[PDB]
Amino acid sequence: IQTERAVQQVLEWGRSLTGFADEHAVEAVRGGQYILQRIHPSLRGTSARTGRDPQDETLIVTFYRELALLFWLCDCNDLGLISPEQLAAVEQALGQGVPCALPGFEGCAVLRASLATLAYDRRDYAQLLDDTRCYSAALRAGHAQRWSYAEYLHNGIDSIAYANVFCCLSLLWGLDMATLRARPAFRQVLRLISAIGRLQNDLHDNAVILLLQRYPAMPVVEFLNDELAGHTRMLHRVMAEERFPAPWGPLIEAMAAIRV
Amino acid sequence: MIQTERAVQQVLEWGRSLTGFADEHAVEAVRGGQYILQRIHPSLRGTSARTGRDPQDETLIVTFYRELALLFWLCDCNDLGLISPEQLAAVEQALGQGVPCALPGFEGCAVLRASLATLAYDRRDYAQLLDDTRCYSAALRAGHAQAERWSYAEYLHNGIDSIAYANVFCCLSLLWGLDMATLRARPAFRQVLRLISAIGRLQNDLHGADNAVILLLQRYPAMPVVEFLNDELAGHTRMLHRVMAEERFPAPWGPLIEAMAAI
Ligand SMILES: C=C1CC[C@@H]2C(C)(C)CCC[C@@]2(C)[C@@H]1CC/C(C)=C/COP(=O)(O)OP(=O)(O)O
Ligand SMILES: C=C1CC[C@@H]2C(C)(C)CCC[C@@]2(C)[C@@H]1CC/C(C)=C/COP(=O)(O)OP(=O)(O)O
């Protein structure tokens, strides 16, 4: 599959989601192509064991649809694209992997049914449902926020959705994240790359704003930038000290620079 | 409960086998240790029938106090350069690997470590203590190494290890059979561990070796450093409270974490 075929396949499915915008499909495919391209070499290697082809169109489009779903949900929250009633119904459906009870959101059932069918290790599917609920809640709790930088960063780590991205990749290509999750070190890296992602976004409510409202005289911009530097170094140190199975090393690095 | 001065003397007797050990190390260890044991005493009484570990066992108590004195002494070895870099490295090897120290003047290390191994209710806790000892050691040196200054993030991550709460909890679990090795399998438990440790680190830096306050002030002179940290400390406390509520950890973990927050 090239690019517009993927974009159109994501867009076609998006028509079954009220509030879906073209950009949700376009940016999901662009970000998704970026990640898959950076981990391709590592993937084809594991392809021997799993039997999951890096170029499998079905797997690629499903991965892109999950990314589009994440972008769409974020806008639904930040921009009120759909009603609060609709959002609650959609989040309930996506979090349990069942059809939405309200009309105009058939895409939820389609995507989740697909993920269940394609899950290499079904434990990743349950984990994805879990990450979806966490994500939904972090978007809501953050929108409704008095917040300390610590609490902000803790919630932001879940609202950035990197955990969901990793879990979807594991689900489709059999990357055994369900097993790697048991290692405290892996969990640590997950938190760091996510915080990196959250800071990069807030810098590019939001961190900068939150700290400015509270500390008018604080160089919040440089501070937050040092924080980003700080987290990146800690990520590297742990990446070395620990040795994660392909394609996790290139994947984590890919996520760190997705600011391209 | 062994009398205070009798415990101090027992800690001091062992401490005499560590170059640079000072009376203060034993005295402060017994004071902090008694504070902790008194606050979790009712709980330990409750688990004693199951474990066979008596809250008033002098051997267990003195051993816990000696580990606390060890941590105080190590902090000073770094902070005041009581021993040479070569001697500190050898001490870290013995305490972090559980082997005899290759250099003379530190017999107390292998002695305390051997007692802990022998006394461990669940031997996993001993290996955990060795791990926590390595983290604590590395953190003391990293902090002291702190030129290119650390980010607040890097500081707190390191201060979480340098505060030694993990070590204290692990030693308690080893001695009184508190099943920390199993509880550590729960993500929520590991989170409260990082939380209570960050809390202890912030409180220490504010109340009264790189310091959070002097750190943020040298890099961000204009920012209201102290105000910020006090806000971050309240933030960690709120997070801790909610997790402790959501999750209902077996006794004595609730009282133990509560006691550390107030110490
Ligand atoms: C919109 C996005 C497209 C997909 C893309 C991938 C490929 C997953 C790589 C990471 C970035 C991204 C998810 C990208 C951005 C997603 C999104 C709009 C983030 C907005 O912030 P978020 O963490 O959702 O919380 P908040 O609502 O912004 O507070
Ligand atoms: C490890 C120590 C022994 C036990 C003691 C109790 C009894 C729990 C009371 C709280 C302190 C402590 C945990 C104590 C801590 C030793 C130590 C000096 C903690 C401060 O961190 P440290 O590594 O010294 O870095 P810094 O010098 O504060 O920058």
H or E segment and range at residue A110: helix A106-118
Q: How far apart are CA A111 and CA A98, in angstroms?
A: 10
Cβ-Cβ contacts under 8 Å for A150 (sequence gap 6 or more): B198, B232, B235, B236, B239
* Alpha carbon distance A143, A164 (integer Å): 19
Token couple for A37: 């391209």
* Furthest-apart CA atoms within chain A: distance in Å: 57
Residue A86 CA, distance from chain mean position: 22
The Cα–Cα gap between B257 and B196 comes to 7
Q: Is B24 on the interface with A (CB under 8 A)?
A: no
CB A172 within 8 A of CB A59: yes
Taking Cα atoms as reference points, which of A40, A55, A71, A34 lies closest to residue A254?
A: A34
Tell me the CB-side half-sphere exposure of residue B33, using CA atoms within 13 A: 34
Q: Phi/psi at B170 (nearest 5 deg)?
A: -65, -40
Ligand 2: centre distance to CA B45 (Å): 27
Chain B: closest CA distance from residue A41 (Å): 33
Token pair in block for residue A23: 């950009």
User: Do A218 and B234 count as a contact with CB atoms less than 8 A apart?
Assistant: no
Query: Which run of H or E residues covers position A165?
Result: helix A162-173
Ligand 1 contacts (CB < 6 A) are: A 27-28, 31-32, 67, 70-71, 74, 77-78, 139, 142, 159-161, 165, 201, 258
Give the minimum alpha-carbon distance from B164 to chain A in angstroms, rounded to a whole number.
18
Residue of chain A minimizing CA distance to B185: A182
Instruction: Give the single-character DSSP code of A115.
Output: H
Which residue in B204, B106, B121 sits closest to B170, CA to CA? B121
DSSP reduced 3-state for A53? coil
With a Cβ cut-off of 6 Å, ligand 2 is lined by B 32-33, 36, 68, 71-72, 75, 79, 140, 143, 162-164, 168, 204, 209, 263
CB B216 within 8 A of CB B225: yes
Nearest CA in chain A to B198: A150
Q: How far apart, in whole angstroms, are the C-alpha atoms of residue B263 and residue B250?
A: 21
Tokens encoding A62: 């499903």
Cβ partners under 8 Å of residue B89, min gap 6:
none
Exposure string for B106-133, b = 16+ CB within 10 A, e = fewer: bbbbbebbebbeebbbbebbbebbbebb
Q: Which positions ≥6 away from A165 have C-beta within 8 Å?
A: A35, A66, A67, A70, A255
Distance of CA B133 to the CA centre of its chain: 9
**In this complex, which of B153, B228, B232 lies closest to A230 when CB atoms are compared?**
B153
Specify the residue with its C-alpha closest to ligand 1, atom 11.
A31
With beta carbons less than 8 A apart as the criterion, state whether B193 and B239 touch.
no
H helix and E strand count, chain B: 13, 0
Rounded distance from Cα B205 to ligand 2 centre (Å): 11
> B235 at the A interface (CB within 8 A)?
yes
Contacts 24+ apart (CB under 8 A), A41-48: A41/A247, A41/A250, A42/A246, A42/A247, A42/A249, A42/A250, A42/A251, A43/A173, A43/A246, A43/A247, A45/A246, A45/A247, A46/A173, A46/A174, A46/A175, A46/A246, A46/A247, A47/A173
Separation CA A4–CA A21 (nearest Å): 16
Resolution of the entry in angstroms: 1.8
CA distance A197 to A164: 13
Sequence-distant (6+) residues with CB within 8 A of A249 are A42, A239
Technique behind this structure? Answer: X-ray
**Which residues are CB-neighbours of A72 under 8 A, at least 6 positions away?**
A14, A17, A19, A20, A21, A24, A81
Separation CA B247–CA A62 (nearest Å): 35
- How far apart, in whole angstroms, are the C-alpha atoms of residue A217 and residue B127? 47
DSSP B153: H
Helical segments of B120-186, H only: 124-145, 152-162, 165-176, 180-183
Asked if residue B236 lies in contact with residue A150, where contact means CB atoms within 8 angstroms, the answer is: yes
- The two tokens of residue A155 are 């919630």
Query: Could you say which ligand is closest to the alpha carbon of residue B136?
Result: 2
Query: Chain B within 8 Å of A23 (Cβ-Cβ)?
Result: no
Question: What is the three-class DSSP state of A231?
Answer: helix
Closest-CA distance, A233 to chain B, in angstroms, reads 9
Q: At what angle do helices A4-14 and A22-50 cross, to 10 degrees?
A: 110
For residue A7, give how far its alpha carbon lies from the nearest alpha carbon of chain B (Å): 38
CA pair distance B174, B177, nearest whole angstrom: 6
Rounded CA-CA distance A157/A159 in Å is 6
Distance B152 CA to ligand 2 centre (A): 20
Instruction: Say if residues A179 and A232 touch (Cβ distance below 8 Å).
Output: no
First-to-last alpha carbon distance for chain B, in angstroms, is: 20
CA B208/CA B192 separation, integer angstroms: 24
Q: Which of the 8 DSSP states describes residue A26?
A: H
Q: Do B153 and A234 touch (CB under 8 A)?
A: yes
Crossing angle (nearest 10°) for helices A207-214 and A184-203: 70
Amino acid identity at B99: V
Q: Which one of B149, B151, B158 makes the best mutation probe of the A interface by having the most chain A beta carbons within 10 Å?
A: B151
Contact between A114 and A171 (Cβ < 8 Å): no
Residue type, A191: R
Q: Which residues in chain B (94-113) have CB-CB distances under 8 A to chain A?
A: none
Q: Which of residues 171-230 of A touch B (CB under 8 A)?
A: 184, 187, 195, 214-215, 217-219, 222-223, 226-227, 229-230
Place of tokens 């105000």: B227
Any long-range contacts for A189-192 (C-beta under 8 Å, 24+ apart)?
Answer: A189/A235, A189/A238, A189/A239, A189/A242, A189/A244, A189/A252, A190/A162, A190/A163, A190/A166, A191/A157, A192/A231, A192/A234, A192/A235, A192/A238
Cβ-Cβ contacts under 8 Å, B236 against chain A: 148, 150
CB B105 within 8 A of CB B90: no
Distance from CA of B221 to the nearest CA of A (A): 9
Single-letter amino acid, residue B173: S
Q: A241 touching B, CB under 8 A? A: no
Taking residue B48's Cβ as centre, other Cβ atoms within 10 Å add up to 16
Partners of residue B152 in chain A, C-beta under 8 Å = 223, 226-227, 230
A237 and B CB contact within 8 Å: no
Instruction: Find out whether A104 and A42 touch, Cβ atoms under 8 Å.
Output: no
How many other C-beta atoms can be found within 10 angstroms of the C-beta atom of residue B46?
A: 14
Closest by Cβ to B235, choosing from A148, A219, A223: A148
Map tokens 């704003």 to a residue: A209
B52: left (phi over 0), alpha (psi -120 to 50) or beta: left
Answer yes or no: do A229 and B151 touch at CB < 8 A: yes
| CA A151, chain centre distance (Å) | 20
- Closest residue by Cα to residue A153 from A98, A190, A199: A199
- Scan for tokens 């870290």, then name that residue: B92
User: CA nearest B215: which of B204, B200, B226, B203?
Assistant: B226
